[PDB]
Amino acid sequence: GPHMRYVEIHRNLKGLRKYMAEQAKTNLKLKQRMGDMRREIRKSVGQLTTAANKDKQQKIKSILTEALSNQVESALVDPNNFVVEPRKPVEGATNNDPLLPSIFVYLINIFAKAAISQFINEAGARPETADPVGICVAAILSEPDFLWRGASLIDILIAKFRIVCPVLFGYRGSEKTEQGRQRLGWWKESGQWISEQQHMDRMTGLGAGFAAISLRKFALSKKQNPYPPRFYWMAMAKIVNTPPAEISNTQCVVLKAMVQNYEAKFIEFYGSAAIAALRTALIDFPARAPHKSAAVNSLEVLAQMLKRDTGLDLG
Amino acid sequence: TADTEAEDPKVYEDEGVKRQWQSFLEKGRFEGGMPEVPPRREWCVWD
């Protein structure tokens, strides 16, 4: 907390949706193609879940390359409305032009929405499915073709994580108050709060999705990491450093999804510092929790497996 | 590479950040909480 710009991007993206609908009335080339372009991205994202399966990532790249060429003659927009920090022209960058086709920003936004929904709908029940999606997000947004002024458009995706999983960004709350459930991202279907199981399922998929995008290794690639592992480190630290009185099960669920299946990658990046961190996340933090639950237990179970595998002892 | 560290290496010169890491560099564990600034590559080396 308390609050920042990532919400402002969410509003501008909502205003972009209306803009594309208005153009579709006057612009026939945009109406002919925009709908099919949207669907083929969602279909390709959904198929990522179910080894040399590279045909679904290319279909998404080809559509974004087509939207960047802007054959549909879409209006141009200022990308500064969709990034946290206003960007200046960068030396050697592939695209320093101040405006971009509105169809491109829009389909990039659909790609981000598609990944968020996959984290929510599939990774919530089967956390394994978040990793192939995260690979696709990092692969596409890092393509030089899609870098605006030397940096990716990842801020369109991160702005959505801020809405549906604020705990990753330091937000806290009591699950007992309505002001707290809002600050924790507890969703509302038809006015009333969703069940506690649907909430924790959302948190599980989003927690696993965050690790999928934040724990990618790019040193072998010629591309720059759009969301390097420092953001995984910062996200974990904001959660585990929560004072005990303010810990919630929402935090424990996200933290479990952040760690489970990503211990090896976390250790490869940060080695002895990852062990110290996993000790804080899987031993100290659960002990600090004010009430036990299946979420706290799950952390303690992971603590034992890692204490056996790593010894969780550097001293 | 620089991906795991803070994007601005000058941050490790701040005394505030040194204090966050003093517990890990001296005792191997995090005593006063997990540092919000990620570590330097050399600090993660296995001894």
Residue numbers in the entry:
A (entry chain A): 212 to 261, 265 to 311, 312B, 313 to 529
B (entry chain B): 510 to 556
Give passages from the manuscript.
To evaluate whether the mode of interaction observed for S. cerevisiae Gle1CTD•Nup42GBM was conserved in other eukaryotes, we determined the crystal structures of human Gle1CTD•Nup42GBM at 2.8 Å resolution and of C. thermophilum Gle1CTD•Nup42GBM in the presence and absence of IP6 at 2.17 and 2.65 Å resolution, respectively. The overall structure of Gle1CTD is conserved between fungi and humans, with minor differences resulting from small insertions or different loop sizes. Both human and C. thermophilum Nup42GBM adopt the same fold as S. cerevisiae Nup42GBM and recognize the same surface on Gle1CTD, with the critical hydrophobic residues nearly universally conserved. Similarly, C. thermophilum Gle1CTD•Nup42GBM undergoes minimal conformational changes upon IP6 binding, which are mostly limited to a loop directly adjacent to the IP6 pocket. The interaction between C. thermophilum Gle1CTD•Nup42GBM and Dbp5 also required IP6, consistent with the evolutionary conservation of the IP6 binding residues among fungi. Strikingly, the Gle1CTD•Nup42GBM interaction mechanism is virtually identical in species separated by more than a billion years of evolution.
